Amino acid sequence: SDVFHLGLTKNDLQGAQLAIVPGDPERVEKIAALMDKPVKLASHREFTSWRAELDGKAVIVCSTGIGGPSTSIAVEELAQLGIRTFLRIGTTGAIQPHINVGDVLVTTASVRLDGASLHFAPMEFPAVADFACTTALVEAAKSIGATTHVGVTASSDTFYPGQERYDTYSGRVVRRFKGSMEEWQAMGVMNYEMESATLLTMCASQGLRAGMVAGVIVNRTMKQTESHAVKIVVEAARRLL
Amino acid sequence: KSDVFHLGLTKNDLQGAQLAIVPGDPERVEKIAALMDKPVKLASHREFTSWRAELDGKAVIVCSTGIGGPSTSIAVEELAQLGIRTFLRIGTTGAIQPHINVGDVLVTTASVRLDGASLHFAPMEFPAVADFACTTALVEAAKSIGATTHVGVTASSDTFYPGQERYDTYSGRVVRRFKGSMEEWQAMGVMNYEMESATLLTMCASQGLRAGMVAGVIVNRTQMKQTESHAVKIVVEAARRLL
Amino acid sequence: KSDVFHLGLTKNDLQGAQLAIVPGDPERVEKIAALMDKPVKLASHREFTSWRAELDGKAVIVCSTGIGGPSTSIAVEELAQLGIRTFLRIGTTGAIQPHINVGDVLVTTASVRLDGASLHFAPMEFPAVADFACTTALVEAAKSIGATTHVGVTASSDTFYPGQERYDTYSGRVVRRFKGSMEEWQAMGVMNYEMESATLLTMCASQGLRAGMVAGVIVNRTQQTESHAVKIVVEAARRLL
Amino acid sequence: SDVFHLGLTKNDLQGAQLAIVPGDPERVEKIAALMDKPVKLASHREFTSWRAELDGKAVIVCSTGIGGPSTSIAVEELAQLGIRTFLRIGTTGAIQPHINVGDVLVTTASVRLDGASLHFAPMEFPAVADFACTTALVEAAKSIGATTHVGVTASSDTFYPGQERYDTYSGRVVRRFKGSMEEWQAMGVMNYEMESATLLTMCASQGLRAGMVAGVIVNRTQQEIPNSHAVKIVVEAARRLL
Amino acid sequence: KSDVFHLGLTKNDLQGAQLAIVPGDPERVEKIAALMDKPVKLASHREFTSWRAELDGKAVIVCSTGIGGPSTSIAVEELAQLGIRTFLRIGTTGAIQPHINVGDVLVTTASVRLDGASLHFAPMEFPAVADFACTTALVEAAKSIGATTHVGVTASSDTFYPGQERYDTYSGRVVRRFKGSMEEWQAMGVMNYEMESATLLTMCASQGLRAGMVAGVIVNRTQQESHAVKIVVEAARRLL
Amino acid sequence: MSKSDVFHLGLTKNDLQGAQLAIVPGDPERVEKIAALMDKPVKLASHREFTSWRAELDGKAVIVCSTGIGGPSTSIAVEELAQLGIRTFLRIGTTGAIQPHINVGDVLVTTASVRLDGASLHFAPMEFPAVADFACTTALVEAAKSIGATTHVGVTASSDTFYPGQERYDTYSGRVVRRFKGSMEEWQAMGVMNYEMESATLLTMCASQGLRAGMVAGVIVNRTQQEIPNAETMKQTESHAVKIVVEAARRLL
Ligand SMILES: O=c1ccn2c(n1)O[C@H]1[C@H](O)[C@@H](CO)O[C@H]12
Ligand SMILES: O=c1ccn2c(n1)O[C@H]1[C@H](O)[C@@H](CO)O[C@H]12
Ligand SMILES: O=c1ccn2c(n1)O[C@H]1[C@H](O)[C@@H](CO)O[C@H]12
């Protein structure tokens, strides 16, 4: 291997320059299977990678695991291997009452409630998505006529307190996040997830292109959800090759 | 009879306008409105000069913001009170990237928040991101005129001098926070420096208002009229696609 | 035509002036200048309108700063480049103390830094303090004409609305940082709110320039004026030449 | 499942109140194999769990995945399931010249270079380990005579810039971390890893006991990346905390 | 006269001492030194009163720090300059947990940094953590002496009043940062409040010096706004 | 509870005899020295680093109470004196200047301080200015002229430490944390006159609570110069600053 965690070589990519990066290792093959010539490359820790072809061009599908830390590793190492465009496809919890489960959300930028983004750029730097990528995802969503929402996403380092969930062992939420969901709601934030702030910030600050699309699994205020989002990211990828 | 404290405008003055082109300089307002139909001066107070025009049958506003986020936040807030829901920032700018030459146009997707006013609307973690529809319209408008466009991040500073790491000053000093900062932004891909977008984009993105920004490159420190006109033509054309 | 980028002034225009009275509104410039000898217009570009006058045979400058720290920072810097060493800001303001009434004059000793520009000159730990000689001159000038004067701290905000905790706005909301802030500043003895002193005082105190500020209260949140505050700033300037 | 990510029920724990939490899912079975009656429970995302028995008491081994975010989910849900004591066993990069690859490092407290810890306590709060757990780990390392070091650990949200690694795609390190390794080194910090700040902070601020131990796989004073003792110690330490 | 600027002590005055017991009140220095062999007064300047004593044939220093991290940082630094490598703070404290009783002994593993001096040695992310051997010696010494002991986190405040959310004050005002803070620390398991440990533990842990912290509970905040000394002395014995 | 209205100072309101102004030096040993410049001085109490005396100035009761080193001990003294009735505080110290033109023996009157402390934050957020009261500053400047000293009026850097916070490297570790590396040069360039360790807390806690506070100090050493005053760096310069704080107090009664 040429990289420390992924266990991949540059030749394994076969010139691929775009990568679809879901969070769950088990979703990798499902995505790769939607394209031509899907082939498993490796599986180490939460990093499962597959290669496939889209319109004749090699494409990579690699899981990031949950959180900005594991995401930063996958992105960095894929970048070392030649990837220049990253499209995250995940699951999300909507916090706006007009966003129903199954809906598709395309993120323009994220509220940085993580710690990893800070390892790439100061907080003043926007965790903004690449225009080309965001455009491709939006156009793709329209192509299949999915109910799409485009906007800001709150990206948290935690699934519980950072998303102001009180149904926990302690039932406590630190001052910083107490009442934070209502604040994000009033600010128009669409949803919560846990990897976009790191992904977008590390890419926008290093000349890498990144997009973010997610399927609504819950509304903080069923199956054809992921499929639609997955179809969208694969279609978007076609326009970014 | 004004409905707002600084702009000296009434909702009636807007004639139903919901979109506003917001340049920084009052002297540029008429020239912009002059590109549209039935342009009429509304008012002039402080750095806030406003004109009303018509685009494809719809009333549009052109109002200056003055220099800086503080002045901008006043114009935007009061315009919002008057009914404006879409704001398009137009201006001329320098550049900090070698590949960006004078005459090019820049469309800002998001801004580095080197201001103070944005913090009065959303914590620093919140992105000073532009509205997708506005950014799309600006890029495509730039497209239709064959403009050489650069789409990316802009550093928005509360100062013209130290915040943009200029040393040709009275003190010749730059506070620790900004020493070596220009090279850091360059390495991070930032296209340029300007002084109102962080405030504009943040206050709009966090209040359900649509905002976008386009600027003509007239200078490049790392290295005049046509550039401007193009930028101006682009913002008006974009406005047309957002009414 | 000009030795500076924005003001459109040359050192020659100042005729050796070392002190400038800096109101925020360009319209107030001529009126202030008119109280001195040989007043004459100098230039007008953007929100920067300048006039020159004379006091006790010494040249004095009156130049507007526009609204906010950003425009103020430009004016102060360029005036400093032209030779100005003493700056006296004069404005109108809204008091937040129940016993500071409309018509009263306020002399600021230092300001709460609720701006962004002051940070481009000194870290937050540094005090946005006024020069002692300037503050003394303003206080002594205020007492020579018998105005009801209050000397103390002022809150300097980058915004007219949320930063001064106003809810009579489009969104009707105030970000967490500022919710309940006016009551806190009140309890801390802060006299009023304005929008340029934090930047002015900080940039001058950290660069060897003298700055002071006086303002007339024309309204009180908790429930001719120009002429007096203006009279005070000119009499004070006289003592600083 | 009683929890959203682990796919476990309280019954799966069989009364277990202590969990050994490695970062790598593939290390779980290996740890469980050193104990009695090892049984696989589940595997979802980066969370692989096994149950085993130690001195007639049930013990859980569950991976956290890399980083504080994944770790915070594992710890929280295990806590919901009844776990009250957590012992992290991981791998680490030493930043002191005389620490050898293979050495066992027991963490007393961590430098919070993460973001998740802040979701449980403000930065002023110490990412300190529980005294009983730390004592158990040290004492255990003592009974098997392993080369051990006890001290502070820098816990980063990134493997690369946050640990000041420059052999990267960009080759740059943001201002905040430029020259940071030298500073931690001068401050006596022993090593780098990526989960302790979160683990220790979230546990110490919620009445949960946590211990941290790791084996050195690279010495950063020499190289950024390399070309069972710690595992035996965490199991033996666990015996003492039952 | 004096090899250090504030303490008025010379390296010769320590007679090879490498461990110092550092109480806050200068008036308690003599008392502590009295529990050991050959106690001798060394100096008294400002809030710094120092005595030298002997424990199991080894020189030991007892020196007051005065109240707060600033005065503490001076004493620790200058004592370090004179050769001290291990510091054991012994103080008084107010418990904020209902189960901790007045008279109980508290051993601090790490402190919440509500001070400013610690930041002069390490950024906030760094833990104000006690030395492991010192903490162990204190816990063990507590068993030996016999006392209801609690081991845990301590909140170290730069103020006695607003920082410990006390309202019995002239203004009766507590700044936003500290409003409702005591209940937050309570929920997070913090045992008590004191004012020197964050600075002490941080400056020591970040400079290769060993530090331990033990205190006697003199009040319990959930109710209102000699074991420890014997324990710190016994712990010192185990650390020589 | 041994006839004290406060927890640390061991003083009662009766002890102040109506005093409303307090001179607050840092060293308890200097309290008696300062009280000696006034009439009928009497020692009130001595507890921890808090030594207090009462004296008469132009026939009015005045308190002199040490604060100890640092904002924490200072905040205790000021708060408890406030509870007892003090409304005006004048700090008098000896300090080391960081400006080349500020010579030993000079007197420094502080208008505001750089908050390099932690206690000030317990009274007001960092954005708040650690500014001195105008009346107090005026009295100190005027008294300086009555005495005839070479005075400098300006900003002071108030640090929670004597060593790294004042960027001193002659220490056990010989290192200075990132935040303070190169900080002295920055403060010098910003016109900061000197370093001391109590003003940020004193000025902030008073300005944010309706109390008046002033700060004056004698320059007994200069961080930029090679030579250092003899055995008595303090005494003469110290006496100058002390004479001034007392003279200033007279105008604030
Ligand atoms: O509220 C939600 C809903 C879904 N997700 C989320 N927050 O975080 C994302 C993690 O990858 C993981 C957390 O379960 O899946 C995504
Ligand atoms: O330098 C190192 C060496 C090892 N580790 C580390 N940093 O972070 C820990 C992650 O879980 C993962 C990163 O590879 O393993 C641990
Ligand atoms: O609540 C309390 C109780 C006791 N102490 C404290 N806070 O701070 C410690 C100081 O040294 C001094 C403060 O009085 O004594 C310690």
**Per-residue CA distances from F81 to B50, C116, D134, F4, F160 (Å):** 58, 37, 46, 12, 22
Task: For the domain made up of D1-242, give the CATH fold.
Answer: Rossmann fold (3.40.50)
Q: How far is the CA of A105 from the centre of ligand 1 (A)?
A: 14
Q: Which amino acid is at F180?
A: F
- Say which residue the tokens 């100890």 belong to: F68
Identity of the residue in F82, F177, F197 whose CB atom sits nearest the CB atom of E70: F197
Tokens 């997830």 — which residue? Answer: A193
Task: Name the residue with the closest Cα to ligand 1, atom 15.
Answer: A91
Whole-number Å distance, alpha carbon A158 to ligand 1 midpoint, is 9
Best to test chain D binding among F178, F179, F180, F181 (most D CBs inside 10 Å): F178
Interruption sites in chain B after residues (C→N beyond 2.5 Å): 223
Q: How many helices (H) and strands (E) does chain A have?
A: 7, 10
Distance between CA atoms of C158 and E194, rounded to whole angstroms?
Answer: 38
With contact defined as beta carbons under 8 Å apart, do C187 and C98 qualify?
Answer: no
Tokens read off for A100: 């129903």
Amino acid sitting at position F230: N
Annotated active-site positions of E, please? 6, 78, 166, 221
How many angstroms separate the CA atoms of A137 and A238, rounded? 10
**Separation of alpha carbons E153 and D133, rounded Å:** 15
Q: Which of F8, F12, F19 is nearest to F41 (CA)?
A: F19
Helix/strand/coil for A115? coil
Chain A: closest CA distance from residue E172 (Å): 22
- Residue A93 alpha carbon, nearest atom of ligand 1: 1
Report the distance separating Cα C201 and Cα F150, nearest Å: 25
Distant-in-sequence, close-in-space partners of C185: CB < 8 Å, separation ≥ 6: C96, C112, C155, C193
Ligand 3 pocket, E194 CB below 6 A? Answer: yes
Are B and E close enough to touch, i.e. 3+ CB pairs under 8 angstroms? Answer: no
Write out the catalytic residue numbers of C. Answer: 6, 78, 166, 221
Q: How far is CA C235 from the centre of its chain?
A: 16
Q: Which residues pair with D52 in a beta bridge?
A: D59
User: For residue D170, which residues of chain B lie inside 8 Å, CB to CB?
Assistant: 187
Q: Name the 3-class secondary structure at D180.
A: helix
- Contact present, F62 and F38 (Cβ < 8 Å): yes
Residue whose pair of structure tokens reads 């009052």 in the numeric block: B26
Touching chains, D (3+ CB pairs < 8 A): A, B, E, F
Q: Is the beta carbon of A102 within 6 A of some atom in ligand 1?
A: no
Touching chains, F (3+ CB pairs < 8 A): B, C, D, E
3-state secondary structure chain C: CCCCCCCCCCHHHHCCCCEEEEECCHHHHHHHHCCCEEEEEEEEECCEEEEEEEECCEEEEEECCCCCHHHHHHHHHHHHHHCCCEEEEEEEEEECCCCCCCCCEEEEEEEEEECCHHHHCCCCCCCEECCHHHHHHHHHHHHHCCCCEEEEEEEEECCCCHHHCCCCCCCCCCCHHHCCHHHHHHHCCCCEEECCHHHHHHHHHCCCCEEEEEEEEEEECCCCHHHHHHHHHHHHHHHHC
CATH number for region A1-241: 3.40.50.1580
H or E element at residue B74:
helix B69-81
CB contact under 8 A, D45 and A46: yes
User: Is A239 an annotated catalytic residue?
Assistant: no
Using a CB-CB cut-off of 8 Å, the residues of chain E touching D110 are: 127
CA dist A64 and E139 (Å) reads 44
CA distance linking residue E187 with residue E172, whole number of Å: 24
Nearest CA in chain F to B176: F186
Token pair 């940085």: residue? A112
Closest-approaching ligand to the CA atom of A91 = 1
Among protein residues, the one whose CA lies closest to atom 4 of ligand 3: E93
Mutate to test the interface with E, among C177, C178, C181, C184 (most CBs of E within 10 A): C184
Resolution in A: 1.9
DSSP letter, residue D82: T
Gap between the terminal Cα atoms of chain B: 28
Question: How distant, in Å, are the alpha carbons of C121, F119, F142 from that of C110?
Answer: 16, 19, 21
Query: Among all chains, which residue has been given the structure tokens 């989910």?
Result: D73
F72 within 8 A of E195, measured Cβ to Cβ: yes
**Ligand 1 near A193 CB (within 6 A):** yes
Give residue C48's identity as a one-letter amino acid code. F
Method of elucidation: X-ray
**CATH (one of 3.30.70.20, 3.40.50.1580, 3.40.470.10, 3.30.70.120) for F1-253:** 3.40.50.1580
d(CA B106, CA B148): 9
Letter string b/e over residues A103-119, b meaning 16 or more CB atoms within 10 A of that residue's CB: bbbbbbbbbbbbbbbbb
Please give the DSSP secondary-structure letter assigned to residue E9.
Answer: -
Query: Closest Cα of chain A to C167: distance in Å?
Result: 14
Catalytic residues of F: 8, 80, 168, 223
Query: Which tokens is E66 given?
Result: 């005065």
Token couple for F82: 């406030």
CB contacts of F186 in chain B (<8 Å) are: 175-176
Q: Return d(Cα B36, Cα B171) in angstroms, integer.
A: 45
Exposed/middle/buried for D58, CB within 10 Å: 0-12, 13-18, 19+? buried
CATH for B1-243 (3.30.70.20, 3.40.50.1580, 3.40.109.10, 3.30.460.80): 3.40.50.1580
Q: Do the beta carbons of residue F213 and residue F89 sit within 8 Å?
A: yes
Q: How many beta carbons lie within 10 A of that of residue F4, not counting itself?
A: 16
Name the residue with the closest Cα to ligand 3, atom 6.
Answer: E194
Catalytic residue list of B: 6, 78, 166, 221
Task: State the distance from the centre of ligand 3 to the C-alpha of E93, rounded, in angstroms.
Answer: 6
CATH class name, domain E1-240: alpha beta
How far, rounded to the nearest angstrom, does the alpha carbon of residue C158 sit from its chain's CA centroid?
14
Burial of D54 (0-12, 13-18, 19+ CB in 10 A): buried
Point out the residue among D119, D157, D160 whose CB comes nearest to the CB of A68: D157
Q: What is the SS3 assignment for F76? A: helix
Q: For chain F, how far is it from start to end, CA to CA, in angstroms? A: 31
CA quadruple C147, C153, C157, C163: dihedral, nearest 10: -100
| Residue type at A65 in one-letter notation | G
How far lies F47's CA from each of D7, E22, E41, E218, F16, in Å?
62, 17, 19, 18, 17
Q: Which of A63, A193, A196, A199 to mutate to test the pocket of ligand 1 (most atoms within 8 A of CB)?
A: A193
* Mutate which: F183, F184, F186, vs B, most B CBs within 10 A: F186
* Contact assessment for residue E130 and residue E87, using Cβ atoms and an 8 Å cutoff: no
| Contact of C118 with C203, CB cutoff 8 Å | yes
Chains F and B contact (Cβ–Cβ under 8 Å for 3 or more pairs)? yes
Do C112 and C193 touch, CB atoms closer than 8 A?
Answer: no
Give the pair of three-digit tokens for residue F23. 């001179």
Residue E206 Cα to ligand 2 middle (Å): 23
Among the bound ligands, the one closest to the CA of E192: 3
